[PDB]
């Protein structure tokens, strides 16, 4: 938390941003067209601000540092002109200190890192002071010359567009035109209303986005060559108004890339004791459940409100896994509201629970002729448990009038006991492992989904089709059109 403030505070520095800032609204290929759109753009011939944080001051001195947080109204346009890698990344959040999950974007000379976590930023970002449980991560390639970025956040989605154009004429924004191609479409779902830059004389221009109605000119290959802004002059307003200057099926879906790590919980060796059950959170994966039921190694695969051979086409937001080891004839106690003490002193289920239950046999794995003695379960407590509560406190349970002051004696007892496992027993005392799956979803983009299919494209027989959701009917054939290498379909 170094203190390097300088306190100069010279606000007024403004420059004209003109014919600058037009991106590709959506992923389509159109050729020789004049399209019209109503969306968030930067007004032509506007005032952008010229921050000059680090500066060589007058003789005998070079010190100023005034890069503050700025309002994030609807989106932002950020332009930089640096001869080196001096600026590095950004921080986004509401209050930036353990109240809303903040977002960090940084990068090396060779790698880039995006992370959403509940930070506690210090003053004048060695950048933060602590980190905790958090949600998302990502790695890819890192992002004179001029570099321009456009940041938008809508509907639980963060979108970043970028462009690199080399100039050497002057420090001001050049006259001319260049569109900005799409780069990143992260799902996060947090809310943002302030931001702050970080760098390691520095100058950058910042401007704000507003809703307008643009007219765009697509040329022969599909690159926005020119644009005109309505509502600027009567002339351009007239420019706007005049608009001038079956046999079978086919299903085809992408590869199956990101398998989901169920090979850990169902294969590990040191699961738990009954009162210290773990909790594993799984997200951002493609999970196939068909491999599980057919495994034939399970002897209890009950379910609640899922209908197993129906779920494979559903997407949730969070999936949790719990795991532990209990004695034999208590697998009939992990269910909706019940009581056999292991449902109301160690583990408790909600009434409207939607999940699945697993139970192996483990006779030949945890056996010990002497006795395993390593698994503990609770026996004494004054009050029952609300759903999903852990208690690892070994306090001495009073059972009499006199306070014993933490002395295990005549009326103060120990609240734990050990399972005596051994191989000469039978079913009903042998150890059964248990894994419980729970599903949840709320107001957030889905991440966990089932695996989709593909059906051996046929082109010369005029049939149905479903290309990644663009259903239709017709005859298919190969073309010579070259898209841009991000566009999907062309209308």
């Amino acid at each position, epitope marked *: 938390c170094v203190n390097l403030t300088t306190r100069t505070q010279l606000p007024p520095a403004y420059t004209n941003s003109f014919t600058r800032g037009v991106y590709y609204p959506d992923k389509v290929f159109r050729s020789s067209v004049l399209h019209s759109t109503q969306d968030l753009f930067l007004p032509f011939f506007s005032n952008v601000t010229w921050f000059h944080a680090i500066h060589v001051s007058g003789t005998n001195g070079t010190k100023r540092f005034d890069n503050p947080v700025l309002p994030f109204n609807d989106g932002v346009y950020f332009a930089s002109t640096e001869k080196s890698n001096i600026i590095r990344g950004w921080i986004f959040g509401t209050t930036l200190d353990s109240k809303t999950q903040s977002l960090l974007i940084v990068n090396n000379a060779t790698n880039v890192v995006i992370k959403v976590c509940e930070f506690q930023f210090c003053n004048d970002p060695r950048v933060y002071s602590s980190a905790n449980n958090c949600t998302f991560e990502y790695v890819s390639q890192p992002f004179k010359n001029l570099r321009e970025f456009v940041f938008k956040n809508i509907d639980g989605y963060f979108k970043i567009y970028s462009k690199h154009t080399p100039i050497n004429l002057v420090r001001d924004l050049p006259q001319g035109f260049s569109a900005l191609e799409p780069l990143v479409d992260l799902p996060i779902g947090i809310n943002i209303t302030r931001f702050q830059t970080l760098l390691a004389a520095a100058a950058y221009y910042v401007g704000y986005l507003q809703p307008r109605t643009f007219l765009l000119k697509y040329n022969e290959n599909g690159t926005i060559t020119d644009a005109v802004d309505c509502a600027l002059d009567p002339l351009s307003e007239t420019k706007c108004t005049l608009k001038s200057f079956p046999t079978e099926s086919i299903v085809r879906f992408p590869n199956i890339t990101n398998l989901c790590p169920f090979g850990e919980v169902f294969n590990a060796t040191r699961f738990a004791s009954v009162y210290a059950w773990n909790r594993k959170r799984i997200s951002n994966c493609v999970a196939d459940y068909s491999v599980l039921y057919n495994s034939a190694s399970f002897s209890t695969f009950k379910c609640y409100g899922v209908s197993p051979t129906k779920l494979n086409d559903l997407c949730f937001t969070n999936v949790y896994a719990d795991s532990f080891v209990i004695r034999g004839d208590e697998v009939r106690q992990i269910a909706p509201g019940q009581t056999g003490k292991i449902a109301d002193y160690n583990y408790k289920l909600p009434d409207d629970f939607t999940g699945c239950v697993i139970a192996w046999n483990s006779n030949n794995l945890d056996s010990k002729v002497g006795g395993n*003695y390593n698994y503990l379960y609770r026996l004494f407590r004054k009050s029952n448990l609300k759903p999903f509560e852990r208690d690892i406190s070994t306090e001495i349970y009073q059972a009499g009038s006199t306070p014993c002051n933490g002395v295990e004696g005549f009326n103060c007892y120990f609240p*734990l006991q050990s399972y005596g496992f051994q191989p000469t027993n039978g079913v009903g005392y042998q150890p059964y492992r248990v894994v419980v799956l729970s599903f949840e979803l709320l107001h957030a983009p889905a991440t966990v989904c089932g695996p989709k299919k593909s059906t051996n494209l046929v082109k010369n027989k005029c049939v149905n089709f479903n290309f990644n959701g663009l259903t239709g009917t017709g005859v298919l054939t190969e073309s010579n059109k070259k898209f841009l290498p991000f566009q999907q379909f062309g209308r």
Partner: antibody
């Protein structure tokens, strides 16, 4: 079945320490407190102290507070008791007794072992 | 501590009473009195535990009760195999317990 086996005899000298072992076969070891008892030759029985095999908490009698220790090795099913710095008049016999409760101190001592004979003289 | 009569006699067939006199907060405080039978050399064996409750193996001929600050045993029926002495135990207090002196049982057989 439920059996306790105690170690062999022992002869020591004044100013020395002695340690005896009691081994449990049958039941599940954790879950029953264990008491020690001493019988003098010709006198009456007396109480020594109790220990627990699950936590480790232990307690003695009022007069035997200084020179007595006692532990439990919950891996090979055994419990040890050591009395140090024996006067020659402490010739007696020591018994290990198991309680019959379940994680409670109750006091019905059954079953008892066999009994060690300890002899200390100059 | 506490004590009881150190002598007792008996004859086959009939019944005798053997006592154990309690103190203020030795026997009359809490209900944990138990009595044992001690052959000459072997280990003891439970004859009665916690008030008058009895394990399986000991016949019903044994009994007991607690008259405030006094415990007792009565054997209505004698098979001459019971000649050794007997001991009475109770929760003395503060996780420390006390036994009794013992009472030799004499038969005329």
């Amino acid at each position: 079945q439920v059996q306790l086996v105690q170690s062999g005899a022992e002869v020591k000298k004044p100013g020395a320490s002695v340690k005896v072992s009691c081994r449990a076969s049958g039941y599940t070891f954790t879950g029953y407190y264990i008491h020690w008892v001493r019988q003098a030759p010709g006198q009456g029985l007396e109480w020594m102290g109790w220990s627990s095999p699950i936590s480790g908490a232990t307690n003695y009698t009022q007069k035997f507070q200084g020179r007595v220790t006692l532990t439990t090795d919950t891996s090979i099913n055994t419990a040890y008791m050591e009395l140090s710095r024996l006067r020659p008049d402490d010739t007696a016999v020591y018994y290990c007794a198991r309680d019959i409760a379940f994680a409670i101190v109750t006091g019905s001592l059954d079953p008892w072992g066999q009994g060690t004979l300890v002899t200390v003289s100059s | 501590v506490l004590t009881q009569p150190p002598s007792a006699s008996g004859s086959p067939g009939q019944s005798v009473t053997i006592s154990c006199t309690g103190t203020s907060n030795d026997v009359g405080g809490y209900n944990y009195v138990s009595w044992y039978q001690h052959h000459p050399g072997k280990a003891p064996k439970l004859m009665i535990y916690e008030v008058t409750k009895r394990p399986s193996g000991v016949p019903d001929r044994f009994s007991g009760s607690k008259s405030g600050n006094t415990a007792s045993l009565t054997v209505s029926g004698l098979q001459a195999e019971d000649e050794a002495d007997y001991y009475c135990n109770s929760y003395a207090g503060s996780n420390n317990w006390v036994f009794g002196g013992g009472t030799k049982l004499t038969v005329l057989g």
